Every structure is written in C-alpha cells, then in structure tokens.
Amino acid sequence: MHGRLKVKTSEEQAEAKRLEREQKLKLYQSATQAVFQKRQAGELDESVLELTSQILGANPDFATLWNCRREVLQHLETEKSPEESAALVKAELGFLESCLRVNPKSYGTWHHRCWLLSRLPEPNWARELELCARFLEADERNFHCWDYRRFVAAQAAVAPAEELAFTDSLITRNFSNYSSWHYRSCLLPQLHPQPDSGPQGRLPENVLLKELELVQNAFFTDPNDQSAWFYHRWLLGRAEPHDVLCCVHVSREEACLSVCFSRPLTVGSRMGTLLLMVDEAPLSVEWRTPDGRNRPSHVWLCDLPAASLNDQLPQHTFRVIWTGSDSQKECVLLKDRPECWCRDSATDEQLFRCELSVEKSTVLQSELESCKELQELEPENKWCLLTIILLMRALDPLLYEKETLQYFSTLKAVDPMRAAYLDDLRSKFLLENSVLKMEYADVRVLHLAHKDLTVLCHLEQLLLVTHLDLSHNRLRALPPALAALRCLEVLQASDNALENVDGVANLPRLQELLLCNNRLQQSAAIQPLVSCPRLVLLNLQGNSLCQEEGIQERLAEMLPSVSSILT
C-alpha cells in the first residue's frame, strides 16, 4: 500500500516465482486457525496470547486478534493474583509498543493501548508520555501520538493551562509543526477567551497580540514552513457572532418582512425561530425562504397583514427576535414610507474586518513592514505574499486596495496552481471594498464593474441594494444566494461569461435584467426567469441563444409577462 518501491518484484527480475515465505504464510494461517478454534471452545488462556502475539507481531492491523487478546485478558483478571495480572499488563504494554514500531499508525494497536490503560486502577503515565515523545521524535507528524497525549492528559486529569504549559516549552528549540499550533488553537480558547459582544477578535487582545508575535518568530526563523502561516491566518480572522440577525427589512408594497442572518440557518428548527413583535404586541407569522422550499438559508421572510401597516397609527414598529441566540432587530416604518430597515454595516458592525485598537494596529502594521522585508529576501515565498494581502486586509482595506491588487497579481504568477482560488479570494475582498464604498456614501447602488470578479460573495449583506452593476467581469453564474437581494430593481450583468442565471429566480422587485454579451447557450437557461414577478426588461443580446428559432416568440411564451425581451 504505501512507500513500497517497485524494484525487484516485476516480470524482469530474472528470478521467477520463487515466491515462498509461504512457509511464513502457512505458519501464519495455521496460527490464525488455531486461535479461532481456541476461542470458540472458550479457551481463554495464555496460549491465545502466545499465538496472537506471533501474528500481531508481524501484522498489527489484524484487528480481530486484538479483540481476542482483550477477551483473554478480561478473563484472566478474575483468575490471576494481582501481581500475576500486573506482569501480564507490563508484558502487554511492551508488546503494544513493539507492535506500534511495526506500524506507528495502526488504529487497532493504539485503541488496544487505550483500552488497557483506561482500565488500570493506577497507571504509570510517565511511561505513556515518554512513548509519545519517542514516536514523535521518530515522526513529528504522527498525529496518533498527539491524540494519545490528549488521552493521557484527560485520563490523568491534567488541567488545561499545564498543557499549554507544555506547548510553550516547544515554541523554541523544538520546531514548527501543524500539530502544536493545532493544539494551542484548542487550548487558548478553552483557557482564557470570553466573547462578550461588541468588539470582535479571536483572542483576548491581550493574548492575541502575543500569540501573533509568537508565530511571528516562527515564520521569520523559517519562512519556508507552513503551519505558522496557516495558524497566523486564523489569528487575524474573525470570531463569528451567531447572535446575528444582520438585517431586517419591511416593504409596505410587498407587505413583507425580510431578514438576513450571518450564516445560513433554518428558522424554527432545533435551536431557534424568529418571533415578531409589531407595535410592541405579538404577531404570529409564517416564515419562509424565497423559494418556499424551507432549506437552510441566510434570507427568510414572512407576509404581513394589512393591520401591521395600515394608517391606524402613523407608525409601526417591528421587533424581530431570533431565539437561538437572543439577538434583536427592531425597524420603524413611518407614515408614508414605502420601506424601513435596520442593517449591520461592514463599517461599524464589524461585518468582516476586525476593528483595531492602537496597540493591535501597531503590531499588525509592524508585521506589515516585515513581510515586505522578507519578501525582498524570499520573493517567491507564496505564504509571505498571501500574508501581506491578509495583513493589508485586517489593516485598511480601502487604502491598500491598489497594493492588494498588485500583490494578488504577483502571488498568482508565483503560485499558478491556486490561480482560481486567488481570483475568487480577490473577488471576495473587492466586493467587500465596494460594500464599504456604498455604505460609506450611504446609498443603495453597488458598483462592481471592471473588477475582474470571478465569483460573488457576501450576498446576504446586500439585502437593501436596489441597483447592482456587475458588468465587464468574468462571472460564469448568478448563484442561488442572489435570492437575498430583496430590493434589487436593476441588475446590469452584461459582458461576463454567464451560462447560468438561476439565482435571479424569486427576486421580488427585479424589473430590469441586462445580460448582454454573455454565454447563455440554449434558451432554456432562461426558464427560471418565469418566477420573477416584476421583470419588464430582459436584454439577451450577444448570447448565442439568440441564433435559436425565431427566438423572439419562444421567449414570449416562456415569459408572457415580460414586456420587453431583447434578443
């Protein structure tokens, strides 16, 4: 299976068959047979141990033989003196470690060793912690011994700051190692962190500064090492609220309240539903997804009765409570307003960029100054170049937007196998910038023309957008997540590579759909627009579905309600 060089066993080794050591396989099979016969006869004695130790000593993954040793050993505990059983156990431990040397990643062998140790009144844990240290110096990437360490630590109690203790004493003349950063990524959050609400970092700023500087000395001392960089990416990024309804919106005309959550959720499932309080008095409503299917969704809505919007008071007030977390969205809809809402900015409500204190800005910005310097030593180091990008982002998306773009182009030339990931990641960040540009200017128009977008992201943050320019990019589909765009009236998506337009379905206010110069092949890809209640201007010019029939009449029957269909 692994690592077996194809050398001398091929039809060209001028040593034909001679495929023996079946002397070993006969021995093997007889021994096997003989164990199986003992066991059904109920002979649970040291004879089974001897014969299985022969077979497991050469193949420690014959799991059924571990079951057999367990049945014997269990049996013997109630027949052997305490000191006879203590020698059997010692002998078992050494026999296990020998079997681990045959295969250091044998699942049945390790579990056999957990079974035995968890049933000792008083184990020697130093024996066990030393075996881990041994199998890790022979292979530092053996994660089985890191799990076995967590087993020792939980069995012996070992409290969680003493275990981080351990990892510290490993940041120095130790090494790198996905397995120790992984462990701290579990230990810290257990040991310190208190996600209170407002400010949104991964680690108590207090520890997140220093755990940055930590992994700094690690990626500076060996840039060409990756665990440090991977762990550092996590450190930069966001804790997730969850206690986030992030938008609520009402339209008088649609008589509909729409909500967008931070993550796709099912309303009315295990731990949450939405309650509605309208004029500070309760309203029983049926929540749904735009498509009426009720799958997990960022965007949910409900119908409102005329009494929630009528002119019986000059105002209505609509408080939405999601009961999973107990986070709250009230919007207030005034006498003659067509709409009202309450939304989370990208800007203030830390939608995707961590807000920085002076102290934090100074360390990230100093590690800005550092990754460049390094870049001049190691210009093809792809990890440094991504982390420069990621470091601009935490830091100030807006201003280093030009640099960001040049860094992406360099990293793409340096790491061409991820070119598709990097375009998608650059698209995401440009759409984030645009949301800041839209919100900064307080409008509802999003302009993402000529940005070389290859994918759309964050669409649930666009619930109030009324005009979207996506023209001149490299999009291949308008995805179903576009269903969050509940106010969208005008979508300019001409001059892209679109071949699928399914997420335009169920858009309630979309009047104008410009799809000029795209890759809509067979009409038919137009079928979903049937569900667009307001569409009035469909421009399909420049697609090859236009050379179809007399096309301007199939589409009329497909889309009888669409007043102007340009092919």
Partner 1 sequence: TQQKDVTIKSDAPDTLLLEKHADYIASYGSKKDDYEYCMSEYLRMSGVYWGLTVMDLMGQLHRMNKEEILVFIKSCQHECGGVSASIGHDPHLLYTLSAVQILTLYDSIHVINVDKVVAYVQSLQKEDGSFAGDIWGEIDTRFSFCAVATLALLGKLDAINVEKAIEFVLSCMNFDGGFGCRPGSESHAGQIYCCTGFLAITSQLHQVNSDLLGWWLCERQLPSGGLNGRPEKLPDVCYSWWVLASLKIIGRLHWIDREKLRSFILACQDEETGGFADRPGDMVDPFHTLFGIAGLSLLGEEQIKPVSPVFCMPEEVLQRVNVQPELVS
Residue 260 parent element (H or E):
strand 256-265
What's the rounded Cα separation, in Å, for the pair 533 and 543?
Answer: 23
Cα 13 to the center of its chain, rounded Å? 50
| Interface pick for partner 1 out of 13, 421, 445, 563 (rule CB under 8 A) | 421
Per-position x/- string for 32-51, each x denoting binding to partner 1 as judged by CB under 8 A, each - no binding: ----x---------------
Stretch touching partner 1 by CB under 8 A, among 95-103, 128-136, 139-147, 524-532: 139-147
40 Cβ contact partners less than 8 Å away, ≥ 6 residues apart = none
In degrees to the nearest 10, what's the CA dihedral of 338, 343, 347, 353? Answer: -140
Instruction: For residue 99, give both structure tokens.
Output: 């079997």
Backbone angles phi and psi of 250, in degrees to 5 = -120, 140
| Interface pick for partner 1 out of 16, 157, 334, 417 (rule CB under 8 A) | 417
Residue 63 binds partner 1 (CB under 8 A): yes
In whole angstroms, the minimum distance from the beta carbon of 270 to partner 1 comes to 6
Which amino acid is present at 2? H
| Interface pick for partner 1 out of 179, 404, 471, 492 (rule CB under 8 A) | 179
Looking at residues 429 to 458 of the shown chain, list those that interact with partner 1 (rule: CB under 8 A).
457
| Interface pick for partner 1 out of 13, 29, 366, 564 (rule CB under 8 A) | 29
Stretch touching partner 1 by CB under 8 A, among 183-191, 331-339, 398-406, 548-556: 183-191
Which amino acid is present at 435? V
What's the rounded Cα separation, in Å, for the pair 281 and 316?
Answer: 11
Residue 474 binds partner 1 (CB under 8 A): no
Do 434 and 447 contact (CB within 8 A), yes or no? yes
In whole angstroms, the minimum distance from the beta carbon of 284 to partner 1 comes to 26
**Closer to partner 1 at the Cβ: 6 or 335?**
6
Which amino acid is present at 217? N
**Closer to partner 1 at the Cβ: 76 or 551?**
76
Looking at residues 292 to 351 of the shown chain, list those that interact with partner 1 (rule: CB under 8 A).
295-296
| Interface pick for partner 1 out of 47, 64, 563, 564 (rule CB under 8 A) | 64
User: Measured at the alpha carbon of residue 315, what is the angle toward residues 311 and 318, in degrees to the nearest 5?
Assistant: 115
In whole angstroms, the minimum distance from the beta carbon of 547 to partner 1 comes to 27
B/e letters for 481-515, b = 16+ CB within 10 Å, e = fewer, are bbbbbbbbbbbbbbbbebebbebbbbbbbbebbbb
Helices (H), 78-155: 82-102, 107-117, 125-138, 143-155
Looking at residues 90 to 109 of the shown chain, list those that interact with partner 1 (rule: CB under 8 A).
107
Sign of CA dihedral 166, 168, 172, 177: positive
Stretch touching partner 1 by CB under 8 A, among 56-64, 95-103, 316-324, 439-447: 56-64
Measured in residues, the chain has a length of 567
Give, in order, the Cα–Cα distances in Å from 220 to each of 146, 168, 173, 359, 413: 25, 17, 14, 21, 23
Per-position x/- string for 227-256, each x denoting binding to partner 1 as judged by CB under 8 A, each - no binding: x--xx--x----------------------
| Interface pick for partner 1 out of 10, 197, 310, 547 (rule CB under 8 A) | 10
Instruction: For residue 444, give both structure tokens.
Output: 């509802």
| Interface pick for partner 1 out of 279, 355, 401, 424 (rule CB under 8 A) | 424
**Closer to partner 1 at the Cβ: 399 or 420?**
420
**Closer to partner 1 at the Cβ: 3 or 42?**
3
| Interface pick for partner 1 out of 136, 371, 390, 425 (rule CB under 8 A) | 425
Cα 26 to the center of its chain, rounded Å? 50
> What DSSP character marks residue 480?
G
Backbone angles phi and psi of 471, in degrees to 5 = -80, 155
Residues that bind partner 1 (CB under 8 A): 1-6, 9-12, 19, 22, 25, 28-29, 36, 58-59, 61-64, 66-67, 70, 107, 111, 114-115, 141, 143, 146-147, 150, 178-179, 182-183, 185-186, 226-227, 230-231, 234, 263-264, 270, 295-296, 416-418, 420-421, 424-425, 428, 457, 479-480
